[PDB]
Amino acid sequence: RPPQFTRAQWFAIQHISLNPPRCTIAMRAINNYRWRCKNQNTFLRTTFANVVNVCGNQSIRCPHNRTLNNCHRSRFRVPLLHCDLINPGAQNISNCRYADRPGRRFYVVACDNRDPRDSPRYPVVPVHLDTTI
């Protein structure tokens, strides 16, 4: 991750967007902080506070990290936009192109204690998007 962000701030930048534009546009906001195009990314059409409250759901195994059990699944399906990189040979970020796949799915996040740079308003925060279902 970019060192200027905590895990939660970088989670919010990648994964929280209520009304994202098309993927090729929406992804520039993320890739501008990277040296290379992110291969896949899901935008959850929700708010950070909403995801923080999902961190309070019962602790479950993370489907994409099966040695971890600090994951939390949403009780409802939420609208999302998934973006897949069409040109993974891209050598820089200037011309990343993405395919769009809108959907409505449950999401699963890993949550952990906040970083000291994070707002004291949320002592526990999402730090990774594990999967959607």
Side-chain angles (χ1 to χ4, degrees), residues 6 79 84-85:
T6 64
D84 284 309
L85 182 62

Side-chain angles (χ1 to χ4, degrees), residues 1 6-16 44 46-56 70-72 107-115 118 122-130:
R1 127 178 65 100
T6 64
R7 286 188 294 160
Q9 289 168 161
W10 187 233
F11 175 88
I13 290 167
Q14 295 175 95
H15 301 300
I16 297 175
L44 309 175
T46 195
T47 65
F48 187 80
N50 287 0
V51 184
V52 168
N53 284 299
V54 173
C55 293
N70 60 310
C71 273
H72 308 271
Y107 62 83
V108 180
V109 287
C111 307
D112 193 2
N113 293 316
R114 74 169 169 100
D115 172 310
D118 279 309
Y122 303 114
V124 172
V125 284
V127 293
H128 96 259
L129 180 62
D130 193 79

Side-chain angles (χ1 to χ4, degrees), residues 4-21 23-106:
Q4 76 197 78
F5 299 126
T6 64
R7 286 188 294 160
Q9 289 168 161
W10 187 233
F11 175 88
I13 290 167
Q14 295 175 95
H15 301 300
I16 297 175
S17 186
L18 216 34
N19 292 94
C23 286
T24 296
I25 293 171
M27 295 298 301
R28 300 171 184 149
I30 297 167
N31 288 323
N32 268 343
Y33 298 101
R34 293 165 52 93
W35 287 107
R36 295 281 188 88
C37 297
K38 200 185 169 183
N39 199 66
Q40 53 85 26
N41 186 66
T42 297
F43 293 103
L44 309 175
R45 305 174 62 183
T46 195
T47 65
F48 187 80
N50 287 0
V51 184
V52 168
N53 284 299
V54 173
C55 293
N57 291 344
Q58 52 188 190
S59 293
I60 57 159
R61 195 172 307 279
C62 298
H64 281 26
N65 288 269
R66 285 200 133 248
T67 71
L68 300 183
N69 290 272
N70 60 310
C71 273
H72 308 271
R73 181 204 226 243
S74 68
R75 292 285 296 269
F76 298 89
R77 299 171 59 188
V78 309
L80 51 80
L81 172 61
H82 186 71
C83 300
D84 284 309
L85 182 62
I86 295 170
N87 61 332
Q91 288 178 26
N92 290 288
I93 56 124
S94 60
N95 36 212
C96 303
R97 297 288 172 75
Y98 286 89
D100 296 78
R101 311 235 274 189
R104 197 182 107 248
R105 299 205 271 283
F106 300 102

